């Protein structure tokens, strides 16, 4: 069988699933951006900007 | 439509399992000592 470091090569010749995995990566990155922004907003102290 | 012709099955033998476990635990030792501070 395929080694554990060659798993993602199944979508090399599959344009549709290549688009699918790229879309999944973009979704994860956007989710990280939103969650990080919310977490930083929950702990920020804007009382003193000096 | 028709089944995807790019279907593959992953595998991992006992030697690879042992190597992975050893790597994980040695890295855990070193960087846990360094992260607990």
């Amino acid at each position: 069988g395929l080694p554990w470091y060659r798993v993602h090569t199944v979508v090399l010749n599959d344009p549709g699933r290549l688009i699918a995995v790229h879309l999944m990566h973009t979704s994860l990155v956007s989710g990280w951006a939103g969650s990080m922004a919310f977490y930083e907003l929950a702990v920020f102290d804007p009382s003193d900007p000096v | 439509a028709k089944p995807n012709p790019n279907k593959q099955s992953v595998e991992l033998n006992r030697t690879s399992l042992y190597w992975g476990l050893l790597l994980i635990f040695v890295l855990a030792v070193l960087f846990s000592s360094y992260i607990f501070n």
Binding site: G1, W4 | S9, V10, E11, L12, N13, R14, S16, L17, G20, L21, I24, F25, L27, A28, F31, S32, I35, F36, N37
Partner: peptide, 30 residues
């Protein structure tokens, strides 16, 4: 001592271990 190191150590130990165990058990069954 950072008390947040316990959870980090546990996660780093367990998640790759579970991934490897899944792969090996599947291969041995096959």
């Amino acid at each position: 001592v950072n008390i947040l190191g316990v959870i980090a150590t546990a996660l780093f130990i367990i998640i790759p271990t579970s991934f490897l165990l899944i792969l090996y058990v599947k291969t041995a069954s096959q």
